[PDB]
């Protein structure tokens, strides 16, 4: 069962050496006792033998083993943050002339990587609606090489129909590299590699770490794509420091108890918001009526704590400040996936600007919440006080 796997994944004796957790091996240089030992390490430098710190130490090997088991992949590449994982995993599979097909609900830095970096390297990008399902077939070009998913979407939380998207992509381009940003699910609430996706990318920064105090990107690839991902990310010098690798493994151990609380609390708050006269719409994958909710219920095994809702009106700048500045428990900050609750606002035109090939369908101010581990009645009380300030 998954809770037993979260506790045990990666904690083999060769990495833990008697402690419960892996050792922390801090290292650039790794010492070869003999020429024959150096030859053996050289041959196995991509297969978990100590060779060089850029390839990893015992601590990295342990985390890689854990992520491969939890996400069901053949290998796991480590990056200094989620944006690095997205950028470098896409880059590992394109050449000049290739085309990228990305959901227009992709995390904004992911879009910006395509339009600002890939574009000047001769790699084009086009977009698709997250609910496009099987109609994505007509958007696959002869030169399309990567299809990039993100389910639920960033900020607006639309859930893909991945079985329909994958089936349609494979009909037109069987050898396409299908990737997903699986951060919201922490890679475990949606088993992407079981759905025909080639690579599952996460900002471990969010729920894997779970305490908002470390940054880490991971990419777990199937056997078909792992050697190319591994070697091309390595050619860009991509790695994670040993101590953060340790903290990522450590975060796995409480991921189950944390996510169950994030799910329980955020769904309760979402249900209350959906009955609220000052709320026009609630974008929570687990709430019935939300875009792609039926796909979430069929394809996911749980929910995390991040969602959004649209207010009944567009706040003016004075109301936005009166609303946001005076919360007692919710804090304004970027990122999410930690133990504390956060709030951020976007006006409709701010979302429209980052929805290429699409138009927004709401006019109220959008509020994105991360529901942390605080008492749910206290968080509700905080939100209710905010509603009172803008009524």
Phi, psi of 344 (to 5 degrees): -145, 145
Instruction: Please give the helix or strand (H or E) that residue 333 lies within, else none.
Output: none
Our finding on whether 232 is near a copy of itself (CB under 8 A) is yes
Q: Which is nearer to a copy of itself, 170 or 232 (CB)?
A: 232
Q: Which residues of 265-287 are buried (b: 16+ CB within 10 A; e: fewer)?
A: bbbebbeebbeeebbbbbbbbbb
Q: Which is nearer to a copy of itself, 290 or 365 (CB)?
A: 365
| Binding partner selected for residue 319 from Cl ion, a copy of itself, none, CB under the kind-specific 5 to 8 Å limit | none
Residue 38 appears among annotated catalytic residues: no
Residues 6 or more apart whose Cβ sits within 8 Å of residue 265:
305, 371, 372, 373, 376, 379
* Tally of CA atoms within 13 A in the half-sphere of 296 that contains its CB: 25
Q: Is 48 left (phi over 0), alpha (psi -120 to 50) or beta?
A: left
Q: Which of 15, 107, 246, 323 is catalytic?
A: 107
Residue 170 appears among annotated catalytic residues: no
Q: Which of 206, 253, 291, 355 is catalytic?
A: 206
Segment interacting with a copy of itself, rule: CB under 8 A, options 107-115, 286-294, 351-359, 380-388: 107-115
Judge whether 51 and 204 are in contact, CB under 8 Å.
Answer: no
Q: Which is nearer to a copy of itself, 52 or 387 (CB)?
A: 52
Neighbours of 150 (CB within 10 A): 24
Q: Which residues of 216-228 are buried (b: 16+ CB within 10 A; e: fewer)?
A: bbbbbbbeebbee
Single residue of 214, 287, 367, 371 touching a copy of itself by CB under 8 A? 214
CB of 137 to a copy of itself, least distance (A): 27
Q: Which is nearer to Cl ion, 173 or 219 (CB)?
A: 173
Our finding on whether 124 is near a copy of itself (CB under 8 A) is no
| Binding partner selected for residue 175 from a copy of itself, Cl ion, none, CB under the kind-specific 5 to 8 Å limit | Cl ion
Residues interacting with Cl ion, by CB under 5 A?
A: 173-175, 334
Residue 243 appears among annotated catalytic residues: no
Residue 260 appears among annotated catalytic residues: no
Residues 6 or more apart whose Cβ sits within 8 Å of residue 18:
none
Q: Which is nearer to Cl ion, 174 or 237 (CB)?
A: 174
Catalytic residue numbers, as ranges: 54, 107, 181, 206
* Binding site residues, a copy of itself, CB under 8 A: 26-36, 38, 51-54, 79-88, 91, 95-96, 109, 112-113, 116-117, 120-123, 205-206, 209, 212-215, 217, 232, 235-241, 243-244, 317, 320-321, 324-325, 331-336, 338, 342
């Amino acid at each position: 069962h998954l809770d037993t796997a979260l506790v045990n994944a990666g904690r083999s004796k060769k990495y833990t050496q008697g402690s419960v957790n892996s050792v922390i091996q801090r290292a650039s240089s790794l010492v070869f006792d003999t020429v024959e030992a150096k030859k053996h390490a050289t041959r196995n430098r991509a297969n978990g033998e100590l060779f060089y710190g850029r390839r990893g130490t015992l601590t990295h090997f342990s985390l890689q083993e854990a992520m491969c088991e939890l996400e069901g992949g053949a290998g796991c590449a480590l990056f200094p943050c989620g944006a690095a994982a997205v950028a470098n995993t896409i880059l590992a599979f394109v050449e000049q002339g290739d085309h990228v097909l990305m959901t227009n609900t992709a995390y904004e830095p992911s879009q910006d990587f395509c339009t600002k970096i890939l574009a000047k390297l001769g790699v084009t990008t086009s977009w698709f609606d997250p609910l496009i399902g099987a109609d994505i077939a007509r958007l696959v070009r002869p030169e399309t090489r990567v299809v990039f998913l993100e389910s639920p979407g960033s900020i607006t939380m639309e859930v893909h129909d991945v079985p329909a998207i994958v089936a349609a992509v494979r009909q037109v381009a069987p050898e396409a590299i299908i990737m997903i940003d699986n951060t919201w699910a922490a890679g475990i609430l949606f088993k992407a590699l079981d759905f025909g996706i080639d690579i599952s990318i996460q900002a471990g920064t969010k729920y894997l770490i779970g305490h908002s105090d470390a940054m880490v990107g991971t990419a777990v690839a199937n056997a078909r794509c792992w050697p190319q991902l591994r070697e091309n990310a390595y050619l860009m010098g991509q790695m994670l420091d040993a101590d953060t690798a340790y903290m990522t493994s450590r975060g796995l151990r409480t991921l189950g108890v944390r996510l169950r609380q994030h799910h329980e609390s955020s769904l309760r708050i979402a249900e209350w918001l959906a009955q609220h006269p000052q709320v026009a719409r609630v974008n929570h994958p687990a709430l019935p009526g939300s875009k792609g909710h039926e796909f979430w219920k069929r394809d996911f095994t749980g929910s995390s704590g991040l969602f959004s809702f649209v207010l009944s009106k567009r706040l003016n700048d004075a109301e936005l400040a009166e609303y946001l500045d005076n919360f007692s428990l919710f804090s304004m900050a970027y990122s999410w996936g930690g133990f504390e609750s956060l709030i951020l606002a976007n006006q409709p035109e701010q979302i429209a600007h980052i929805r290429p090939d699409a138009e927004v369908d709401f006019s109220g101010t959008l509020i994105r919440l991360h529901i942390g581990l605080e008492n749910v009645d206290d968080l509700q009380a905080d939100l209710a006080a905010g509603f009172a300030r803008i009524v």
